[PDB]
Structure 1
Amino acid sequence: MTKTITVAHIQYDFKAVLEENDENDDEFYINVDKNLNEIKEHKIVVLGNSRGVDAGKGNTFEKVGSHLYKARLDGHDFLFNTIIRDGSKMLKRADYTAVDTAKLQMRRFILGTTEGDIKVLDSNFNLQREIDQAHVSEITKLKFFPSGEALISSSQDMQLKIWSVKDGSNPRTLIGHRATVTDIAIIDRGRNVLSASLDGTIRLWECGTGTTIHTFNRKENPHDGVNSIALFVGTDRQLHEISTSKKNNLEFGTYGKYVIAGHVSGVITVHNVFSKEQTIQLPSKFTCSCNSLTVDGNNANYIYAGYENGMLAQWDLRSPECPVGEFLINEGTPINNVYFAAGALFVSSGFDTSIKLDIISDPESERPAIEFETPTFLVSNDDEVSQFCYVSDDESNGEVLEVGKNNFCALYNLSNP
């Protein structure tokens, strides 16, 4: 707050340069953006004889893991995390705009395209089902229900659709949004879902009936479009019911739920899903759109919000008057997506930038703090991340899946040398 996270881009095939093992000197570049738009081109020489690397005086470059490299260049630290698997290998070419995963027994993946197609994939990224023309236009979001046996999609076509994983059937179509549906949150098992839209609404739906039972919006301006939503639990007790009194028609597990909404104006609003009260509004401190936000997975008092100017802010909902951290990433370039997983924040910036930022608890404690001085870049071939998906595999380890345009579907290892 306000400190800037220095972005580096490594030559995508640099690993092949390092393990080439040629007799002669070779070289790869690391471009460091400095407003960004301009840059410093660092040349890392890969000495022949496999006798190592020369990063220049005062600089280092080194392998710290099978798929993890560390550079220090002009006093800035960078980590570079390389692909462990291309998931687009056996897939027909689409521009991916949405992803989710589920694993009850078998692990599965769903992907949504700019063309409106949904693909169901298995553990090995082999196509298991294609739902062609699932929507008229771009799938903006895809979620499995917790059963793993159903899914919900959202689209520019202003509808949401519930699909069966069994047969690709479409038992429900949720209509009523007046603009693009941008986001989805599932309440508990999903008898209720929430959808966000550029029409300014967050609609609470009951799925059995396929109707909207409540519409939330920004109290100051109901037409301020919603880019992102996140659901959190205010308190983790106690249903049926440790207090008086209820209840609300056609609501299932809404009690103690709050929904956070990032707006086109850049404000953020928080709604008690049960009471229907707007509890909080965070100011558009940066005078631009809040494109994406996400809740801290350890402490839901803390949220992370990415804005159209490249500001990443951390807010404490208890103290809504000012952010508790501000971090510029390629100022002037939009943050497209922020996503909390495995004690880290994943951040898509502009057309080319994907960063994993570690979150620690502050020593002078104890409140989560972004490790902004030591970003990790998920190395691609100048590919654009539309969305991240955390894959805890079988047994509490993890990988991150990125999907994007031009058939980008790439897996990254998160665990440590």
Structure 2
Amino acid sequence: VKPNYALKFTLAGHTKAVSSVKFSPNGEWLASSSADKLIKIWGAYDGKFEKTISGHKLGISDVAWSSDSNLLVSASDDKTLKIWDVSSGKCLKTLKGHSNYVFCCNFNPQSNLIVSGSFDESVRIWDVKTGKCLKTLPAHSDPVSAVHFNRDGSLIVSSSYDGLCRIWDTASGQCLKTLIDDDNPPVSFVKFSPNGKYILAATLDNTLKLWDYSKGKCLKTYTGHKNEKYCIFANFSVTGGKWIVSGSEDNLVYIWNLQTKEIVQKLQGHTDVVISTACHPTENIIASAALENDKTIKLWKSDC
């Protein structure tokens, strides 16, 4: 079995490189963040532009949805995060305290916490309702590329240019686990598997790895794409066949069989580094987005 993703829409309108795309948990919306300092909301099924959300003074590197699809959190080069009420577009909070670029962000499943990582080498845990920083973790010795909560919000995984992935206890803020590899290439992305038992980690040696973090064992590797320069996010695709999905610096979307590690499809049509991909939570739909030469978002659909 192989997927047959086909281009359905190309969404133009960001005036600089796109940095991330995320589907709302309820499946209704796609959100995109850009170096052009904007967030844009699009209809997930018809591609229709919904609205522009603005207020960051510098470009945005990441955006994330609350579990109830009502809020967005964005991370900016202006060293802040912002919490936005989606239906109004109003900024609800500005999260202040990082001393350098904010690179990555996520809500916990309860959506009372936001986790963030920054070029200042720290991971911060923020109270959503007050906007107050609850904890500053001295997580890494170089910029933090990714932060992600597990299924119940009791753990955080972080990754850094320093070459490490770390598993943190959310309530105590203590490091429970450090994944150390020889040759320690920079880690450009990490996230928990849907069941929270594994982590998917990208390194800037053109390599994705599926790890048992409790066992400290690497179960799968995925290769064939190009990832040497940029923090490209990867996804678990679970609505049809079980795939691994990632952008690539050769302008393609790559799709691997999760179990066999074979490449099952390559999506062509972007004209620059595909910096971000996202998988729709209920339909076999992929959103992809690209850097300065392209600046577009593409929606793809498959029967499996």
Measured against the shorter chain, the TM-score band is: 0.7 to 0.9
* 1:393 and 1:399 in contact (8 A); partners too: no
Residue deviations 1:8-47 (CA, integer Å, cap 9, x gap): xxxxxxxxxxxxxxxxxxxxxxxxxxxxxxxxxxxxxxxx
Q: Which runs of 4+ in 1 moved over 6 A?
A: none
Does the alignment pair 1:129 with 2:5?
no
* 1:228 and 1:291 in contact (8 A); partners too: yes
* 2:142 and 2:162 in contact (8 A); partners too: yes
CA 1:411–1:168: 2 relative to 1, 3 Å: closer
Aligned to 1:340: 192
Does the alignment pair 1:380 with 2:232?
no
Aligned to 2:155: 302
Does the alignment pair 1:264 with 2:119?
yes
Whichever residue aligns with residue 5 of structure 2, its letter is F
Q: CA deviation at 1:293?
A: 1.5
Aligned to 1:354: 208
* Alignment partner of 2:239 out of 390, 393, 396: 393
Distance 1:382 1:352 in 2: 5
* 1:383 and 1:408 in contact (8 A); partners too: no
Counterparts of 1:124-203 in structure 2, within 5 Å, are 124-132=4-12, 134-165=13-44, 167-203=46-82
Distance 2:169 2:29 in 1: 34
Aligned to 1:228: 104
* 2:168 and 2:175 in contact (8 A); partners too: yes
Distance 1:416 1:167 in 2: 33
CA 1:167–1:353: 2 relative to 1, 3 Å: closer
Distance 1:202 1:329 in 2: 31
* 1:185 and 1:229 in contact (8 A); partners too: yes
Counterparts of 1:1-400 in structure 2, within 5 Å, are 124-132=4-12, 134-165=13-44, 167-218=46-97, 222-234=98-110, 257-284=112-139, 286-297=140-151, 299-320=152-173, 322-329=174-181, 331=183, 333-342=185-194, 343-359=197-213, 369=214, 371-380=215-224, 382=226, 386-394=232-240, 398-400=242-244
Distance 1:157 1:149 in 2: 24
Task: Tell me how large the CA RMSD over aligned residues is.
Answer: 2.5
* 1:280 and 1:317 in contact (8 A); partners too: no
Q: How many residues align?
A: 257
- After TM superposition, the score normalised by the length of structure 1 is 0.56
CA 1:381–1:195: 2 relative to 1, 3 Å: closer
Distance 2:219 2:131 in 1: 39
* 1:191 and 1:208 in contact (8 A); partners too: yes
Gap regions ≥5 residues in structure 2: 262-304
CA 1:319–1:146: 2 relative to 1, 3 Å: closer
- After TM superposition, the score normalised by the length of structure 2 is 0.76
Q: CA deviation at 1:181?
A: 0.8
Whichever residue aligns with residue 217 of structure 1, its letter is K
Q: CA deviation at 1:167?
A: 4.5
Gap regions ≥5 residues in structure 1: 1-83, 86-122, 235-255, 360-368
Q: Percent identity?
A: 19
Whichever residue aligns with residue 154 of structure 2, its letter is N
Q: CA deviation at 1:146?
A: 3.2
For the pair shown, the structure with the greater C-alpha radius of gyration is: 1
Distance 1:378 1:266 in 2: 28
Whichever residue aligns with residue 271 of structure 1, its letter is W
